[PDB]
Amino acid sequence: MLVANINGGFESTPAGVVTDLAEGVEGWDLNVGSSVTNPPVFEVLETSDAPEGNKVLAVTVNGVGNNPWDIEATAFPVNVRPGVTYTYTIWARAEQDGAVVSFTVGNQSFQEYGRLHEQQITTEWQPFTFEFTVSDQETVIRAPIHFGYAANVGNTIYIDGLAIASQP
């Protein structure tokens, strides 16, 4: 089923440490700013525990910064429709319980529809979702997932499930 989010859950991304987050996952790209005082680990892993298929992005967060945007993994490109409502669902799971992450949505106009930053994540896969409709008329959007927080430090956060689909 051609969904709006493609590779949002690292589905086509084959396991293997990433060398360039910008060109790591076709549906997931990462970006580190001067806030990343410590080098985070961006790599894909293949296990039978992933919610979407068996591929996810295992990240090693162990060094936040003075800015609320050290490590950020966004998802794109995404497809939507003007007037139609879409759905947003994702699954997060870190090695040790006590990890925080954020998942917002916004097109290339700095606009945003959904937004759920500051979500507690257990060592298992937690399904989080919500709804959002094209505010203006963006046929393509991207959900920038935030990372680089003290609650996400000393813990590897695996993310997978960022998918956008409308109701049946």
67 residue type, one letter: N
Residue 147 has φ and ψ, to the nearest 5°, of: -155, 155
Q: Please report, for residues 24, 38, 127, 148, the alpha-carbon distance to residue 62 in angstroms, rounded to integers and kept in the order given.
A: 20, 7, 24, 8
**Cβ(87)–Cβ(80) under 8 Å?**
no
Among candidates 110, 94, 109, which has minimal Cα distance to 147? 94
Answer whether CATH 2.60.120.260 is correct for domain 1-168. yes
Q: Please report, for residues 8, 56, 160, the alpha-carbon distance to residue 47 in angstroms, rounded to integers and kept in the order given.
A: 17, 8, 12
**In a 3-state reduction of DSSP, which class is residue 150?**
helix
Separation CA 68–CA 149 (nearest Å): 7
Among candidates 102, 164, 89, 90, which has minimal Cα distance to 134? 164
